[PDB]
Structures are given as C-alpha cells and as structure tokens.
Design a binder for this molecule. Structure first.
Ligand code: CO
Ligand code: CO
Ligand code: CO
Ligand code: NA
Length: 262
C-alpha cells in the first residue's frame, strides 16, 4: 500500500521535515572531542520536546531506548547513545533524527567530523553525500526506483567504496517506515514507478571497505564486518509534478530545495 499524500498532508510533512532538519543544525556546536553520545542525545531530546513541542519517533519504537541514533566510525546505523561513549579527534559520526509533529514524521541524518578530520573520513563523507545528491537529482514522476538504486551503487563503487545492502530508505508519513523499500543498489527485484504525492527517504550507507555488516549482541548496533568506516546521509522528499522537493533541507545543504525537470 503506497500512500499518496494530499496537499494538506504535504503541508504537515514540510513542518515536521524542517523540525527535524533544525535539530541537526542546532546540535553542531556541541559536537566536539570529549562530549559523550549520551549527552548529545539528551540535548536533542530536550530541544525536540521543550522547544519544538514535538516528539522523537525513535523513543520506544520497537523498544528503542533513546531519542536519536548516533553512529560512530565503523558503526553503520542504530548506534545507541551512551554516557560512556566519548568522541575523539578524527571520529566521523552520524546523527539520525526522526521527529513527529501533528502526527507526521520528518526523518533526516548527516555526518559530523570531530575535531581534525582524517583523509579517509573526509573523503568518505563527501562521497556519501554526493551519492545522495545524485539520487535526488533523478527523482521525478514516471521513473522506476530501480534506476535510482542502480545509479547510487555505480557512483559509489566507482570511487572504491561499497554500498550496504541490508538497510534502505522507506516511505514515510503518518507512519515511520512505510512502503516502499528504497534500495540503494541495483536489484532486479525492484519495480516501483514514481508518482506525485509519494513521500519517502533516500539514506545510503556507504562503507570504506567491504559491504558486509554484522549486528551486535545488543540487538541494535550494526557495524561493518571488516571494521572499515561507514557513512550515511538522509533526506525526506516528496515527488512533485516535475521533480521533487526536499523536505529536510538544511542551511548547509548545497542542493536546491526544489529540483525541477523540464
Ligand atoms: Co515554546
Ligand atoms: Co533516519
Ligand atoms: Co529513514
Ligand atoms: Na558511521
């Protein structure tokens, strides 16, 4: 069941989308060596609840214990915030936020480099973001999702990195994870034609090393099998009549918010 949003729905998504983006903008100054991921999680949660008057979609979802997901270095996704986990110079960290406002979800994430960046970390983050931007520029009514995954993969692999297969983008709206599954690679299994009013995320996870991943015994944390660095970026978008609109665009994004094809 792929839900098509009404104009009224889209309006509420635009609000939730900006709320989510703002959490990312807000947190930046706190990301420095010596801060713990547990502290970053508290600041985010406080902000969401007390200032934004919204709510974290993650808290309690399937039993998830925290408000945001913070993944450092080799952690692929779902890293659990913790008071004992301190950031060090050179770490790369993803903060994945999902907020609910008036019943609609806004989901986005970005990488942050702590202190002095490493060559590998900088490059990996760059390539990952570019792969997301690439996909965004392709979105328009009529195209098959398959083409998008194929493009991301080709890009990434051409640059010597790999794409994680197991986790992917998803529809989103009143529900956190709705149809469809947005794969970040080429798969003959994929056959979805885009149409206006569809809302979903693109959130490619790219590994510096091999594509293989492993789940941790905590049941959430996912890490690379070869312990290479892994990066991810994410945006929520709505398919428009002639392209797409990025609902979670931030001040530091360098892609326009409305992408038009003609
Ligand atoms: Co207020
Ligand atoms: Co997310
Ligand atoms: Co998502
Ligand atoms: Na990571």
């Amino acid at each position: 069941a792929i839900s098509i949003k009404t104009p009224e729905d889209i309006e509420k998504m635009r609000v939730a989308g900006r709320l989510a983006a703002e959490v990312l903008e807000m947190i930046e100054p706190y990301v420095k060596p010596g801060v713990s991921t547990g502290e970053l999680d508290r600041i985010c949660n406080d902000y969401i609840v007390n200032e934004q008057h919204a709510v974290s979609a993650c808290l309690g979802y399937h039993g998830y214990p925290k408000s945001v997901c913070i993944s450092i270095n080799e952690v692929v996704c779902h890293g659990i915030p913790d008071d004992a986990k301190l950031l060090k110079d050179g770490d790369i960290v993803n903060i994945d936020v999902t907020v609910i406002k008036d019943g609609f979800h806004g989901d986005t994430s970005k990488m942050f480099i702590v202190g002095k960046p490493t060559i590998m970390g900088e490059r990996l983050c760059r390539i990952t973001q570019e792969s997301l931007y690439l996909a965004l520029r392709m979105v328009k009514p009529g195209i098959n999702l398959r083409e998008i995954g194929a493009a991301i993969q080709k890009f990434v692999e051409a640059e010597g990195f790999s794409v994680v297969r197991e986790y992917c983008g998803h529809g989103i709206g009143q529900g956190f994870h709705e149809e469809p599954q947005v794969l970040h690679y080429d798969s003959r299994e994929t056959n979805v034609v885009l149409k206006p009013g569809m809302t979903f995320t693109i959130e490619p996870m790219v590994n510096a090393g091999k594509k293989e991943i492993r789940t941790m015994k905590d049941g959430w944390t996912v890490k690379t099998k070869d312990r290479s660095l892994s990066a991810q970026y994410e945006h929520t978008i709505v398919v428009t009549d002639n392209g797409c609109e990025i609902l979670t665009l931030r001040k530091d994004d360098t892609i326009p918010a409305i992408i038009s094809h003609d």
